[PDB]
Amino acid sequence: ILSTASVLAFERKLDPSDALMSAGAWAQRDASQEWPAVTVREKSVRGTISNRLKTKDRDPAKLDASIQSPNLQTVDVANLPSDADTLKVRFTLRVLGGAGTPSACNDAAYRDKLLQTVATYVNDQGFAELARRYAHNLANARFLWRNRVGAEAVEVRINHIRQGEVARAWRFDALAIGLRDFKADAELDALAELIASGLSGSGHVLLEVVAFARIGDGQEVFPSQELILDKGDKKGQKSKTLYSVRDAAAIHSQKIGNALRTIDTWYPDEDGLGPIAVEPYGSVTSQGKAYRQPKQKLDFYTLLDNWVLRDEAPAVEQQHYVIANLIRGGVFGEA
Amino acid sequence: ILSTASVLAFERKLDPSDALMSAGAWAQRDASQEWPAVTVREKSVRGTISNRLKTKDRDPAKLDASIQSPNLQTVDVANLPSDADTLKVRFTLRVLGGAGTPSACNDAAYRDKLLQTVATYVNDQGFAELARRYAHNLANARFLWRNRVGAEAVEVRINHIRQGEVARAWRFDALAIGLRDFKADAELDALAELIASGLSGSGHVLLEVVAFARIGDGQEVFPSQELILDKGDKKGQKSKTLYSVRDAAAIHSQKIGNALRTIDTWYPDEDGLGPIAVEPYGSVTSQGKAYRQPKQKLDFYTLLDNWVLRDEAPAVEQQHYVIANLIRGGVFGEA
Amino acid sequence: MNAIHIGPFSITPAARGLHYGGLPHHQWTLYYGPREMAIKTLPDSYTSSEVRDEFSDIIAEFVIDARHRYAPDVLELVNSDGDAVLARVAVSRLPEALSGCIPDDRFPYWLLTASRPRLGLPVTLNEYTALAVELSAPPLAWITGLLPGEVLTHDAEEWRPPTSWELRHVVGEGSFTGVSGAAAAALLGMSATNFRKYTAGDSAANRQKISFAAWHYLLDRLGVKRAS
DNA sequence: ATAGCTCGATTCGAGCTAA
DNA sequence: TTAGCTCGAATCGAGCTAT
Numbered sequence: 001i002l003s004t005a006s007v008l009a010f011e012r013k014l015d016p017s018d019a020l021m022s023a024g025a026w027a028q029r030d031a032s033q034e035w036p037a038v039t040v041r042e043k044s045v046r047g048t049i050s051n052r053l054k055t056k057d058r059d060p061a062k063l064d065a066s067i068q069s070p071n072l073q074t075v076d077v078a079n080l081p082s083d084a085d086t087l088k089v090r091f092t093l094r095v096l097g098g099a100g101t102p103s104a105c106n107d108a109a110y111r112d113k114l115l116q117t118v119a120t121y122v123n124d125q126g127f128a129e130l131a132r133r134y135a136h137n138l139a140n141a142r143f144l145w146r147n148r149v150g151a152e153a154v155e156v157r158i159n160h161i162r163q164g165e166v167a168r169a170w171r172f173d174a175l176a177i178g179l180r181d182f183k184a185d186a187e188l189d190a191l192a193e194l195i196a197s198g199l200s201g202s203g204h205v206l207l208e209v210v211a212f213a214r215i216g217d218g219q220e221v222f223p224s225q226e227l228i229l230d231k232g233d234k235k236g237q238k239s240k241t242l243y244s245v246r247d248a249a250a251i252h253s254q255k256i257g258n259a260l261r262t263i264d265t266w267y268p269d270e271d272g273l274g275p276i277a278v279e280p281y282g283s284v285t286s287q288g289k290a291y292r293q294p295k296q297k298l299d300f301y302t303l304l305d306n307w308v309l310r311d312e313a314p315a316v317e318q319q320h321y322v323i324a325n326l327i328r329g330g331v332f333g334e335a
Numbered sequence: 336i337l338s339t340a341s342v343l344a345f346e347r348k349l350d351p352s353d354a355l356m357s358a359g360a361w362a363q364r365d366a367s368q369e370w371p372a373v374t375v376r377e378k379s380v381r382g383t384i385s386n387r388l389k390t391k392d393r394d395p396a397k398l399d400a401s402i403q404s405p406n407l408q409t410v411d412v413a414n415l416p417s418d419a420d421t422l423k424v425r426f427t428l429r430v431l432g433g434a435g436t437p438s439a440c441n442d443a444a445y446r447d448k449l450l451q452t453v454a455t456y457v458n459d460q461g462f463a464e465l466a467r468r469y470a471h472n473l474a475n476a477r478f479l480w481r482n483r484v485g486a487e488a489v490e491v492r493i494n495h496i497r498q499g500e501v502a503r504a505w506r507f508d509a510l511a512i513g514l515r516d517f518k519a520d521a522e523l524d525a526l527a528e529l530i531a532s533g534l535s536g537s538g539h540v541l542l543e544v545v546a547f548a549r550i551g552d553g554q555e556v557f558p559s560q561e562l563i564l565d566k567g568d569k570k571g572q573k574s575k576t577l578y579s580v581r582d583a584a585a586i587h588s589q590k591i592g593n594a595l596r597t598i599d600t601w602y603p604d605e606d607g608l609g610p611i612a613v614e615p616y617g618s619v620t621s622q623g624k625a626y627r628q629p630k631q632k633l634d635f636y637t638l639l640d641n642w643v644l645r646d647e648a649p650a651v652e653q654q655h656y657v658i659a660n661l662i663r664g665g666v667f668g669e670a
Numbered sequence: 671m672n673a674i675h676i677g678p679f680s681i682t683p684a685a686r687g688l689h690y691g692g693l694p695h696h697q698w699t700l701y702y703g704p705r706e707m708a709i710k711t712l713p714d715s716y717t718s719s720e721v722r723d724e725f726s727d728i729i730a731e732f733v734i735d736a737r738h739r740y741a742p743d744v745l746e747l748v749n750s751d752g753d754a755v756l757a758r759v760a761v762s763r764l765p766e767a768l769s770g771c772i773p774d775d776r777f778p779y780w781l782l783t784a785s786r787p788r789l790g791l792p793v794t795l796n797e798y799t800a801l802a803v804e805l806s807a808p809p810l811a812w813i814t815g816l817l818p819g820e821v822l823t824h825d826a827e828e829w830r831p832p833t834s835w836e837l838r839h840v841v842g843e844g845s846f847t848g849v850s851g852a853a854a855a856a857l858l859g860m861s862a863t864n865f866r867k868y869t870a871g872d873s874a875a876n877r878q879k880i881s882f883a884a885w886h887y888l889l890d891r892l893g894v895k896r897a898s
Numbered sequence: 899a900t901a902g903c904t905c906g907a908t909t910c911g912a913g914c915t916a917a
Numbered sequence: 918t919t920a921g922c923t924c925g926a927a928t929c930g931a932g933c934t935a936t
Contacts, residue, residue: 006686026499043578044562045589048618050665054819055828058630061764061789062743067618067625068770068787072562079580079588082355082425085499149346150431152498152539216541217427217496218352220588236564288342288441335685387772390751623770623787669818675900843899850899861930866901873902878928881910 002113002309005106005333012329013099013199014134016257019091019143019209020250021221023084029155029212035088037248038221040078046070075240078221078249085217087147090210091256093138095194097201099127099327106333113308118326121319122200129320130327131195133263135188141174141211142259143251146222148174152214160194161206174211180274182265199327223249261328266317267291268298278324280332300325304332337444337644340668344439346431347664348534349469349595354426354478354586356558358419364490364547367423371416372583373556378412381405408572413584417553424479426591427496428542430533434662441668445643452643453661456654462534463527464655465662467517468598468610470526474512476546478586478594481557483509488549495529496541503529509546515609517600534662559587596663601652602626603633613659615667635660636667671696674718676844678702678835681725687714700725702732703835733846740815742807744784747798750775752782757798761805762898767791808897813839813846822895824886831879834871840892841869847892857891858884 021038049066080087100118105111141147141154148154154174160167170187177183198205215221224243232238243250261277269291276284280300282292292299297306303322306312313319325332357370384401392398415422435453440446473493476483483489489510495503505526512520533540550556561576578585596612604626611619615635617627627633638657641647648654674681684697694714698721700707708728712721743764747757752773764783771790773780781798782790793801814822816839820830840847841854849857855865867878880888889895 041580043587044560045587046620047589048614048616048620050615050618051670052636052668052819053629054814054822055629056819056823057763058628059763060625060628060630060766061768063616063628064624064768065743065764065783065785065787065789067620068623068789069785070620074562077588079353081581082353150350150429150539152541214499216352216429217543218355219427219429220350220352235562286439287443287446288439289443390753669820851901852899862899863902863931864929867928869900870902876903876928881928 002109003107004305004309005110006335007104007106007331008102008333009104009331010326010329011096011098011101011103012257013096013327014257014260015094015096016253016260017092017094018245018250018253019089019256020245020248021078021223022088022090022248023080023221024086024088024212025084026086026153026212026214029086029088029157032088032210032212036081036084038078038080038087038223039247040076040223040242040244040249042074043077045073045075047073072235073237073239076225076238076242077240078223078242080215080218080221082218085214085219087144087213087215087221088210089141089144089147089213089251090208091143091251091253093207093209093260095198095205095207097199099199099323110308117308118323121323125316125319127196127199127327128192130263130324131199132188132192133182134195134260135191136177136182137260137262138191138207138209139172139174139185139188140177140179141213142179142262143209143256144211144213145251145255145259147213147215150216152216154211154213157210157212158191159208159210161208182263182275221249224252224255257328261324264321264324266321268293268296278321278328280325280330301332337448338442339640339644340437340441340445342439342441342670343437343667345434345437345661345664345667347592348431348434348662349530349592350429350431351478351588351591351595352427353580353588354424354591355580356413356422356424356556356584356586358415359421359423360419361421361488361547361549364421364423364492367545367547370423373413373415373422373558374582375411375413375577375579375584377409379407379409381407407570408574410575411573411577412575413556413558413577415550415553415556420550420552420554422479422482422548422550422556423545424476424482424586425543425545426478426586426588428473428544428595430530430540430542432534432536434534434658437667449643453658456658457535460651462531462658465598465659466530466534467519467523467527469530469595470523471512471517472595472597473526473542473544474507474520474523475509475514476548477514477597478544478591479509479546479548480586480590480594482548482550486510486548486550489546490548491544491546493526494543494545496543497539509548517598517610556584558584559590596659598659599656601656603631613656613663615660615665639667671714672718674722675838676722676725676729677842677846678838679725679729679844681721698725700728707732736816736846737812740812742811745802745805746782746784747793748773748780748782750778750780752780752788758784759802759805760807760811761802762807762811762895763805764789765791765801765805804898806898808893808895810847810893811895811897813894816846821885822889826882829882831881832885834869834877837869837880840889840894841865847894849892854888854892858888860884 022035023038024032024035048070100115102111138158139156141156144154156172156174159169170191194205197203226241226243228239228241243252258277262275264276264278265271267276267282276282276291281290281294283290300322303314303318307314307322356373358373359367359370435450476489476491491507491509493505494501529540532538559578561578563573563576578587593612597610599611599613602617611617611626616625618625629637635657638649638653642649642657671683680701681698682701688695690711695711696714697709698712699709710724712724742760742762744758744760746755748755750773768789768791777792779793779795779798780790781793782788817836820828821832821836823829838845841849841851843850851865851869852862855862867876868880870877886896890897
């Protein structure tokens with residue numbers, strides 16, 4: 001009957017590194033290895049109430065009393081220096097083979113169907129579309145999440161590494177390649193076999209991904225934010241903390257991986273909004289609506305049952321999605 | 336039934352940088368790129384009892400005892416050099432655009448109708464009245480808050496920095512363009528479509544604003560103040576702390592952006608005060624009160640639901656207030 | 671074992687198990703609705719009333735924090751100096767005519783706020799009692815901070831009926847008021863079987879919604895709102 | 899006290915007329 | 918604002934249950 005195993009833990013492929021930030025100036029991007037790092041400092045903010053009220057009653061004295069004692073906060077803030085207008089973000093992406101092999105399972109019969117159905121998938125169509133689409137999110141600076149909304153010109157330079165030296169260098173203009181359309185380009189195509197060879201297990205791939213963005217002169221850069229333990233008084237609340245590795249602003253590695261995973265364009269709703277991240281139950285917390293509802297037969301879990309247990313193969317664009325949850329890893333299976 | 340969204344987080348437009356302050360003498364402002372920065376130094380003060388007493392400390396024995404036990408505290412002080420009478424503040428302002436699009440919004444139906452409402456506003460009239468009042472606050476040294484109340488001659492220079500170079504230059508007289516009325520000027524209107532293009536989203540735009548002010552020799556300059564953790568001794572209380580980035584006194588980014596936000600003249604109360612900032616519930620920190628209270632139905636939130644949900648659009652001057660608050664950005668929706 | 675439901679809280683166990691030491695063990699997870707507060711690994715030999723006692727202190731801390739951060743504003747009645755507090759009353763909303771005030775001698779009684787930038791209003795004892803009667807706060811008024819503003823509004827067009835989880839905040843054995851479903855039904859003058867349909871969850875067959883008058887009268891009788 | 903059910907009777911909302 | 922009326926849908930009480 002080939003029941004589903006209890007544990008389906010999968011190793012994460014396309015493993016990124018923490019993208020630390022450094023600051024500098026444009027046209028000096030070649031000798032940017034000695035650029036000063038972006039430090040995270042503290043500043044005090046004061047503000048009045050700007051959120052909605054309870055709206056049950058219309059007392060004016062209470063809202064005026066909130067202006068009598070404005071809230072005082074200290075927030076972690078990261079800014080470029082007054083002599084720098086370019087933000088440098090560098091991280092390394094490690095590409096691993098053996099996508100279909102689970103890290104932990106609970107049935108040898110179940111695994112042998114999984115490793116066979118991903119072999120028949122790769123033989124029919126290998127790691128070509130996903131590797132191409134994972135190349136798009138490295139081409140455009142999607143990992144520059146809020147550092148791309150108003151950049152004058154953001155440039156991505158990635159170098160393939162062998163033995164500790166460059167193998168082949170790619171140079172891209174991230175404004176040219178949009179965040180919506182998955183077009184075709186020769187440098188984008190040439191990057192695809194490198195990702196394809198690493199994903200198929202035929203070779204090792206290490207890429208050093210560098211992004212230079214024209215944020216502006218002394219403007220604000222936006223690293224990842226940490227949790228607030230709320231162990232201080234209401235005035236020194238420390239309401240915002242930013243992630244720094246060693247006195248240098250940095251972006252969480254899982255936030256970088258989320259930008260790479262944004263290749264899903266076959267969710268059941270209208271796809272003109274834009275790509276979403278490949279993820280079970282197609283859920284993104286920005287708009288708060290989860291595409292690929294399990295009530296519909298289009299989420300990752302039910303197709304994984306049809307594509308394996310009862311051998312009901314979906315459309316080939318969906319089989320790219322089912323392996324897209326396998327390549328990103330995850331703790332699957334019924335607990 | 337088109338209920339409002341629970342989360343309506345909006346990105347802020349018109350993002351300013353920290354305003355660095357350096358000092359010098361007048362008539363050398365054409366070559367002010369090597370002026371020494373206004374340094375932060377420390378001085379000690381003592382004062383007498385100048386506060387009201389709670390009907391018990393008014394006894395002559397108790398009052399004189401407090402004078403015999405003076406409050407010694409150190410304060411943070413910023414002054415110009417004795418040979419310098421000009422204060423310049425330099426910040427960069429970038430205009431983003433796409434003000435109608437929220438970062439987070441739950442109801443897709445509400446997002447489409449809100450985007451339709453913003454697009455309906457843009458077609459009727461663009462961001463011309465908005466940017467005219469925004470450039471008026473850039474024309475005067477309103478962002479030079481307390482260093483303008485006694486300025487003898489204050490002058491601003493605004494430069495359009497497109498490809499890291501001055502694409503178009505501006506020079507205004509801040510005292511002539513007072514902080515009371517929003518008149519029309521050909522040079523001000525020339526700046527108006529520069530921000531209006533940024534607010535509309537046609538192309539990237541970035542400005543540099545330098546405001547020279549005739550302060551006086553060794554006079555007191557007023558940067559933004561900080562919070563004190565209140566942990567040290569009462570003699571070294573540090574009752575005042577000012578903001579600095581690298582041994583140079585500076586003004587907070589949100590302090591500068593608040594002054595550029597000061598375009599709201601449409602609040603129902605009498606105009607003895609003048610323009611205020613466009614933030615919901617019309618809060619004025621100095622007066623401790625709030626114009627546009629929800630009781631008389633002229634705050635941001637009631638106008639937004641009237642414009643979007645039940646389709647009763649407000650007055651055209653009130654539509655300016657709603658979009659200006661939409662440009663201002665905030666965490667809207669039921670938190 | 672079974673998911674223990676304590677009012678708005680729900681201690682659900684992990685489907686899988688573990689063996690810490692040699693004894694059987696399970697991961698129990700405290701929930702405040704969709705919010706996760708704690709994971710505690712516990713043996714399988716513990717009864718439900720003992721896992722409840724194990725998770726009781728975190729619930730007590732949550733209730734203390736909720737009562738403190740949502741405490742109603744306190745008003746102070748003072749003499750013509752402002753030093754002696756003659757009477758204090760907690761109010762659900764401030765008086766309409768409050769402005770920034772420092773008491774003087776021309777009026778004997780002043781109604782000031784407890785916040786340090788003290789707003790105030792010159793009143794006599796009769797007007798002070800009128801304001802106290804109009805504006806008083808019920809003893810359990812802090813539970814309104816844990817409830818949405820659209821289920822507590824008095825406007826019928828903008829009112830939304832509370833869900834089952836929002837209803838568990840005020841009725842139930844482990845609720846914030848501590849009244850049973852039978853007592854709540856007796857307060858509304860209805861049968862307990864009909865109120866259990868209000869408090870029913872995940873049972874789509876025969877689940878009902880409370881009405882505007884019933885909800886607001888229940889909030890009146892429990893001491894949560896409208897008890898000025 | 900929790901949790902949930904069925905079944906016939908009563909209530910309930912949004913149409914409508916009628917004045 | 919008074920004074921009603923169908924019509925299907927949701928609610929109400931009082932029987933039972935289960936834990």
